[PDB]
Design a protein around this ligand. Sequence first.
Ligand code: BCL
Ligand code: BCL
Ligand code: BCL
Ligand code: BCL
Ligand SMILES: CC[C@H]1c2cc3[nH]c4c(c3C)C(=O)[C@H](C(=O)OC)c4c3nc(cc4[nH]c(cc(n2)[C@@H]1C)c(C(C)=O)c4C)[C@@H](C)[C@@H]3CCC(=O)OC/C=C(\C)CCC[C@H](C)CCC[C@H](C)CCCC(C)C
Ligand SMILES: CC[C@H]1c2cc3[nH]c4c(c3C)C(=O)[C@H](C(=O)OC)c4c3nc(cc4[nH]c(cc(n2)[C@@H]1C)c(C(C)=O)c4C)[C@@H](C)[C@@H]3CCC(=O)OC/C=C(\C)CCC[C@H](C)CCC[C@H](C)CCCC(C)C
Ligand SMILES: [Fe+3]
Ligand SMILES: [Mn+2]
Lengths: 302, 281, 238
Amino acid sequence: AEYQNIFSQVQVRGPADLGMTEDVNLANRSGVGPFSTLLGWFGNAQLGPIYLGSLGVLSLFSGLMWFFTIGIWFWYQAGWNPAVFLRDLFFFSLEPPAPEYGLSFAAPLKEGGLWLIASFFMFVAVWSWWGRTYLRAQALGMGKHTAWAFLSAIWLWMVHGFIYPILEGSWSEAVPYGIFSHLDWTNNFSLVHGNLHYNPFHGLSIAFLYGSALLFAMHGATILAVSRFGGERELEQIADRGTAAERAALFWRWTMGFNATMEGIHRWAIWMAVLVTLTGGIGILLSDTVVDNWYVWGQNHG
Amino acid sequence: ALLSFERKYRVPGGTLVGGNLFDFWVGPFYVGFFGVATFFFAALGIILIAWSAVLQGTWNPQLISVYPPALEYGLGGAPLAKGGLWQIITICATGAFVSWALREVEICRKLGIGYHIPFAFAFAILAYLTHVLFRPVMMGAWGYAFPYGIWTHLDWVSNTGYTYGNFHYNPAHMIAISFFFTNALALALHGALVLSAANPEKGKEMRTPDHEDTFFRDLVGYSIGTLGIHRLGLLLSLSAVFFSALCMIITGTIWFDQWVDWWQWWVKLPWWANIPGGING
Amino acid sequence: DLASLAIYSFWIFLAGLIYYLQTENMREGYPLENEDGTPAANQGPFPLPKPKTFILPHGRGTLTVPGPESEDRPIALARTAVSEGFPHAPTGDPMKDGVGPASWVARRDLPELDGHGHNKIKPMKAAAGFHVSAGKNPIGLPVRGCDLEIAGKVVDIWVDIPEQMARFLEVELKDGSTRLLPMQMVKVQSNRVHVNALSSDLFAGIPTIKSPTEVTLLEEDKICGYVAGGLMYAAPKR
Ligand code: BCL
Ligand code: BCL
Ligand code: BCL
Ligand code: BCL
Ligand SMILES: CC[C@H]1c2cc3[nH]c4c(c3C)C(=O)[C@H](C(=O)OC)c4c3nc(cc4[nH]c(cc(n2)[C@@H]1C)c(C(C)=O)c4C)[C@@H](C)[C@@H]3CCC(=O)OC/C=C(\C)CCC[C@H](C)CCC[C@H](C)CCCC(C)C
Ligand SMILES: CC[C@H]1c2cc3[nH]c4c(c3C)C(=O)[C@H](C(=O)OC)c4c3nc(cc4[nH]c(cc(n2)[C@@H]1C)c(C(C)=O)c4C)[C@@H](C)[C@@H]3CCC(=O)OC/C=C(\C)CCC[C@H](C)CCC[C@H](C)CCCC(C)C
Ligand SMILES: [Fe+3]
Ligand SMILES: [Mn+2]
């Protein structure tokens, strides 16, 4: 039997590589953390350092408040009782304000107003955060690829709890922070607009999600069978092809009628997925406002 | 008909069976015994897919569809039209994913690399099998499987799920869902990185596998590093699918009731089980 | 309606992405060559993209693809048949010759750098502060081939300084010289390193490095490659 380089067989360490530097302000860099012999069987064993700018704080700060505001209220419902808390942990839920309030900011604390608070923070913490991944990429004079891909999500997120909700007139159309509740919220939304198996921008999103699990499953299996040729180094194969990428290639082209490259395969991917939340943000964005039943429209196509 | 660097490879060998007999190409397509096989099965299949569309009385694809043998047949033979074909059409579909897997193997041998690929692939095979071979035999009835159809199999999913109410509650199916989510978040990145390392701001030198790392670390205080990621991925997926196949082999055989119910066991725990307040008191 | 519109228009958007994608993936390997290396008739439906330029680092230059395709070397292979798509016999010894599974590429005779500009791949004994931090250390351990005979021993491990990772095992052969082996192709155990790929007697054949403290990209390929090839040409002894 052979080595499947799934986990390394030997670990090795050296000092801490405090990372490149370029324009980055090393002042906001943190001190390095410890090395785990754990992650080490899988990937790096090095933890840290971490760049916490002003933005890094903001985002994280609102990040908690958000997460906290949800805690308080869960504590309220459990009647300040721990065991309860631990028992009904999943059924608790901070629901949006009521349909009557529509899109107003008067909603009484106990009915929506605490749900608004929490969202307010989540926004800020999601946008400020996106933002960081920009700058960091900039401090690295690197491709805003990442900063873009992420947006793709913020997309779906933005529709799911702000765009769509503003288009149906009321806060009561958004999702509630809850573990089982939102689960259902989904289910209902499915039934409330014909069946979603029909909404095509949903049939599509399925495709990609699925697709990303098909692709990624490949790229990895692949890279792995051609590491014994220093293939993991996709970067330096790009700039100076090796037998790694050649072999990566011919296997697929002798298999499925074609092939990618080492830079390329990375663009397939990137999209293959960026599109799950893209097609989506649409799909949902349409059901109800532009199409009240999806089965129907599966008959007329208008 | 060949890539610029294709010739220095096309040597003979790599055959698991038949020797050189089928050791050759056709278009950029490798062949081998299994190349053939998946041809045999595929065709034979596409054909019995045409007989049921006539026996069905239509040639619109979205409409075409072939159905399992109804519950009444059990786990035995069924008249063509009512399951019979569905049965041979599955056989074929099977022999062709399998063949298609082995051929891949021969390739990993002529190209002398890893078996990571077909291996990986063997999972989606499994996932398939569960559907048309495992779950059914335990629930004792072919019928329980899905219908090969463009929308009919969708409805096969829609009703089967709801047979257990909201399916979100089947927990094994929560798991499966997480992976199908991260995985994708993964590829999302790998691709954003690699490419944000490889296509820097205009005017600068390619970046380095070193820059990649620094990113994340300065972003989420950690890097799994280029080999790991590519390992992470293999897992995120194979798992995501390992589990699905799981939450289905259990639905109807060991848990068949309301899924959402299952979850009582937790709230119905001695200590807190009674206490008043919350949502279950 | 707005929904029909949007669903078509996406299709269009989707087609065009496919394009862009497909092309982008041809900056290498393309154009196709006939079985004698002369351009091909049918280049398919997709065109060669307009060349793009990579500004390599550490002044090592520029890369521009699509570029002028060159194997840059001799291929000891000949047709076994009259018509196309057949195998291509190895005139001699595929191992030495650099063909098939053993094939190796003409990549710069330079080594991979890290991002600071100092040699990416170094050998432990010179790697400052680098030690084995976990697992069965193979240093001093005996190397056994596929025929089950000893062939040398381990004297050092080379490591990816930046990615703190292990990629090779400097092996000292019977004749006092060393050969590098591909981690990913060895199976360290309790009392021995076991290489399935090669048998004792071919260990020598493993190509050598000019510098003992660094290895050039071109150099890695030749090794691994040779190593690989072992899987199929070394089988009559394994
Ligand atoms: C996983 C749980 C359910 C299931 C649930 C769903 C759900 C839910 C959805 C689909 C959807 C799809 N499913 Mg399904 N599907 C199942 C099992 C299968 C099997 C099988 C052999 O078991 C097949 C071929 C398919 C195929 C398909 C696609 C036609 C379509 C998705 C596109 C996609 O993302 O592809 C991923 C892979 C690729 C893009 C690769 C390219 C290969 C293409 C897709 C092959 C098409 C083959 C054609 C159907 C068969 C031709 C055979 C003839 C003999 C020539 N499903 C099981 C039973 N499927 C989606 C849909 O309805 O879209 C309109 C959708 O929303
Ligand atoms: C029973 C209900 C319906 C149904 C109803 C819906 C509904 C309703 C929706 C989907 C949506 C989706 N469905 Mg569905 N769906 C059904 C059946 C299926 C089947 C199947 C095989 O049967 C499949 C494959 C799918 C697949 C999919 C996906 C393609 C898509 C979601 C992508 C995603 O990952 O979003 C998840 C990704 C994100 C949320 C990314 C954004 C990340 C955010 C911003 C991060 C927040 C972080 C937080 C602040 C921090 C937390 C951690 C901190 C440490 C605290 N559905 C059934 C039939 N489906 C969604 C869609 O958009 O459809 C068009 C959607 O709205
Ligand atoms: C698009 C379709 C639906 C939808 C459909 C589904 C479906 C279907 C499933 C989930 C599941 C989950 N969904 Mg959801 N989900 C939607 C919108 C959201 C929103 C939001 C702000 O809009 C959030 C925070 C979540 C969050 C979650 C997770 C709790 C859980 C998945 C784990 C996972 O894969 O993690 C991946 C995470 C990462 C890669 C990031 C790391 C973050 C870590 C793991 C911490 C997460 C903490 C969690 C969010 C805390 C919740 C408690 C707070 C008090 C609110 N969903 C929309 C409305 N969701 C799955 C489940 O079963 O859960 C139990 C599941 O099956
Ligand atoms: C109301 C319905 C229920 C529900 C009921 C079910 C049920 C019931 C099932 C799933 C299953 C799945 N569900 Mg669900 N599911 C729901 C909601 C969701 C949501 C969501 C966001 O709401 C999500 C993300 C999912 C996600 C998922 C997936 C994890 C999983 C299917 C993937 C898989 O492994 O396929 C398996 C993949 C394969 C079989 C494909 C293998 C490839 C084959 C062999 C090759 C085909 C080749 C082709 C014919 C030829 C191509 C060649 C041509 C020339 C091109 N569900 C709701 C709540 N879900 C399924 C599962 O777990 O399956 C195991 C399942 O049975
Ligand atoms: C195709 C789209 C895919 C995708 C992409 C994606 N997600 C992304 C990105 C991208 C490209 C990011 O750049 C961003 C990221 O940063 O990723 C690493 C992100 C991200 N995707 C996330 C989640 C996520 N993505 C998902 C999905 C997907 N993401 C898709 C598959 C899903 C699911 C399950 O479908 C989830 C849950 C986030 C983790 C992350 C963006 C982070 C964010 O928005 O944060 C706001 C800030 C907070 C929540 C801060 C507080 C966190 C804790 C509550 C703190 C409390 C404890 C701590 C110990 C306290 C310490 C205190 C100190 C004082 C000591
Ligand atoms: C972790 C599991 C994930 C995964 C992995 C995966 N798929 C893989 C591999 C791997 C590792 C491959 O190596 C292999 C490949 O080579 O891909 C390029 C493949 C592959 N995954 C494929 C499809 C596929 N994978 C899917 C999913 C997934 N694959 C998961 C997300 C799905 C979805 C989303 O459901 C599909 C459709 C194939 C394109 C390809 C393998 C090629 C192949 O099997 O070819 C031979 C094909 C035939 C012989 C087709 C004809 C068959 C019969 C004669 C008739 C048709 C019968 C069938 C029942 C009809 C169904 C109709 C529906 C409408 C109901
Ligand atoms: Fe990659
Ligand atoms: Mn509505």
